[PDB]
Amino acid sequence: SSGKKPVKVKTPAGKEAELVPEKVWAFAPKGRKGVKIGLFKDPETGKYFRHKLPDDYPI
DNA sequence: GCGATCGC
DNA sequence: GCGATCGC
Question: Which positions does the record annotate as the modified residue N6-methyllysine?
């Protein structure tokens, strides 16, 4: 699923930024809450990277 | 170790 | 086929 709300994240390049993830999903084992993961693209470098989403972010 | 996802 | 993403 795509996202729409921006997320505050630290790019691989070190800069803080507000980015709309291209994909989001839940990442959890059986019996545990786990985390939500977003797939982001650093607009300066063009590189993709993953980052934790806030617990209330809509999947 | 468990979970999903995809660019590389 | 794997790295890297986190909290348990």
Answer: 15
Experimentally determined by: X-ray
Q: What is the CATH number of the domain that holds A27?
A: 2.30.30.610
Asked if A59 contacts A7 with a C-beta cutoff of 8 angstroms, the reply is no
CA of A34 to C1' of C7 (A): 6
Do A21 and A41 form a contact (C-beta atoms < 8 A)? Answer: no
Q: Among chain A residues 1 through 59, which have CB within 7 angstroms of nucleic chain B?
A: 22-23, 25-32, 34-35, 37, 39, 46-48, 50
Resolution attained, angstroms: 2.3
The count of structural domains within chain A is: 1
